[PDB]
Amino acid sequence: DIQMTQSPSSLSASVGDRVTITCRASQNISSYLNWYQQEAGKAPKLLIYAASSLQSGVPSRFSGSGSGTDFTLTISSLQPEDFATYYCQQSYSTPRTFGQGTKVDIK
Amino acid sequence: TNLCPFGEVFNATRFASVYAWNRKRISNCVADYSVLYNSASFSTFKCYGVSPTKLVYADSFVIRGDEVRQIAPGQTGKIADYNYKLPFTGCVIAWNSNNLDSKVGGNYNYLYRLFRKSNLKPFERDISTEIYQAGSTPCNGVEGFNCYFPLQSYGFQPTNGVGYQPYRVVVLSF
Amino acid sequence: QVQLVQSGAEVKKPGSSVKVSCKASGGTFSIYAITWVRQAPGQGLEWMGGIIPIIGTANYAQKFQGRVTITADKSTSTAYMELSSLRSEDTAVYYCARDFRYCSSTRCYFWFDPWGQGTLVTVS
Ligand SMILES: *[C@@H]1O[C@H](CO)[C@@H](O[C@@H]2O[C@H](CO)[C@@H](O)[C@H](O)[C@H]2NC(C)=O)[C@H](O)[C@H]1NC(C)=O
Ligand SMILES: *[C@@H]1O[C@H](CO)[C@@H](O)[C@H](O)[C@H]1NC(C)=O
């Protein structure tokens, strides 16, 4: 299977700060990485797909870059509505692989 | 004195999708084709080898507008090469069905082949769901990761440009 | 517009079975794929398996082979899953999604947009 490594496991930040999250696979997969946000009590939703495109309509709060084995997600200016967990999925195998997940915390 | 059900061929409640075509044979029928020729409801009425004023296998399906020109001998493209390959003598008749097929939210009852192992032979109808192998390694049942599900759907909807309008196409081969 | 609507919580005890489902709207029911994922309280999210109804054979993760049946009903446009031989460690929220893909040229990319609500099963 594909090992999806997601870190830091904890990213505190203030509102208006920047958040950087790393999603690296042990395998070189050119562009199948997706990022999801999960709010408390809810099913997860997609933010970013196929490495860098947005789906949610979010006003450029999330963006990122990289290819093959690596990838970096950045939060451009963290807002109150973003205090949610995040996780990576690499859509390149059966089973699909998910990372362990991370969260953005508060001061 | 005995005109056949051209009306069933044309005024079908539902049309076949490319990939899963409705092949009807017409025999023992008056060839009154003035009914199609003089009808203003049709747009394309391109006759090959036959005069349209003098003019059977009736192959019907729904295609998007940019691809209408592919239903012809000598053509290439997603439909001409992977769905419906034509060699022919007869006419290709088509009309804009936007008011029949374009549903709100999108009409997703039509499906076309995008990924194929080889170019189709004339009138070959491949109706299988076999997974496209891409070429780097056998899929072995894996989902589409540099491996592909062979067909893509195509939705039709009320707001579209010309190339995105659905067309009902009937190919009458003689 | 493939909104998925899924069933609520269930409590059947270990040794029995739990069947859950998600009804799909929008269209193109037969392709792309119905997949199920689960997560325990604590987001140890994993793929269980899924099915492309036009083929109808499914593909399962090694953790659920022989335990979970994933199927689909084309006329009901509904996703189904049933876990047999229930255990207390199976407590999780189960989710549906459609494996939507976008294709261009010779490559397609896959992601999950139409997430359901989550069905909580607590066999205890
Ligand atoms: C499909 O149905 C339409 C009716 O909606 C048929 O159109 C009629 O055809 C007759 C015979 O030429 C005309 O006298 C009528 O005035 C037409 N009515 C309308 C509303 O167009 C059409 O001929 C049928 N198609 C085929 C191939 O038989
Ligand atoms: C990673 O994938 C790209 C695109 O498929 C390829 O060009 C590159 O050589 C690969 N790199 C490694 C280390 O496998």
- Nearest CA to C81 among C3, C25, C1, C4? C4
φ, ψ for residue A72, nearest 5 deg: -125, 130
CB B82 within 8 A of CB B124: no
Query: Residue with structure tokens 């994922």?
Result: C37
Total domains present in chain B: 2
Please enumerate in sequence order all residues whose Cβ is within 8 A of that of B44, keeping only pairs 6 or more positions apart, or say none: B68, B92, B93, B94, B95
User: In terms of domains, do B53 and B121 share one?
Assistant: no
Q: Are residues B83 and B139 in the same domain?
A: no
Residues of the domain holding B9:
1-105+158-174
Instruction: List, in order, residues 6 or more apart from A45 with CB less than 8 Å away.
Output: A36, A37, A38, A39, A56, C113, C115
Q: Which one, of B122, B61, A45, lies nearest residue C100 by Cα?
A: A45
Q: How far is the centre of ligand 2, averaged over its atoms, from the C-alpha of A29 (Å)?
A: 8
Q: How many helices (H) and strands (E) does chain A have?
A: 0, 11
Could you give the CA distance from residue B85 to residue B132 in angstroms, rounded to a whole number? Answer: 19
Structure token pair of residue B106: 């999108």
C101 at interface of B, judged by CB pairs closer than 8 A: yes
DSSP 8-state symbol, B168: E
Q: How far is the C-alpha of C96 from the C-alpha of A1, rounded, in Å?
A: 22
CATH code of A4-105, in short, is 2.60.40.10
C-alpha to C-alpha distance for C84 and C70, rounded to whole angstroms: 11
Q: Which one-letter DSSP state was computed for residue B137?
A: S
The H-or-E segment that residue B100 falls in is helix B98-101
Produce one character per residue of A35-44: b if its CB has 16 or more CB atoms within 10 Å, e if not.
bbbbeeeebb
> H or E segment at A67?
none
Contact C78, C70 (CB under 8 A): no
Rounded Cα gap, residues B66 and B155, in angstroms: 14
Q: Is the peptide bond prior to B150 cis by the omega test (within 30 degrees of 0)?
A: no
Q: Residue B64: which of B27, B13, B111, B29 has the closest Cα?
A: B111
> Which chains does chain C touch, 3 or more C-beta pairs < 8 A?
A, B
- CB count, 10 Å around CB of B130? 12
State the resolution, in angstroms.
3.8
CA-to-CA separations, B159 to B14, B105, B106, C27, in angstroms, rounded: 21, 10, 10, 17
Does residue B1 sit in the same domain as residue B21?
yes
Q: Are residues B41 and B100 in the same domain?
A: yes
Residue C73, both tokens: 């009903």
Contact (CB, 8 A) for A38 and A86: yes
Are B60 and B145 in a shared domain? no
**Topology of domain C4-121, CATH:** Immunoglobulin-like (2.60.40)
**What share of residues in chain A are helix, strand, coil (percent, to 5)?**
5, 45, 55
Q: Pick from B134, B112, A43: which is nearest to C112 by CA?
A: A43
Of residues C27, C54, C108, nearest to B148 (C-beta)? C108
Among C25, C31, C32, the strongest candidate for a mutation testing the B interface, having the largest count of B CBs within 10 A, is C31
Give the residue, by CA position, lying nearest to ligand 1 atom 22: B7
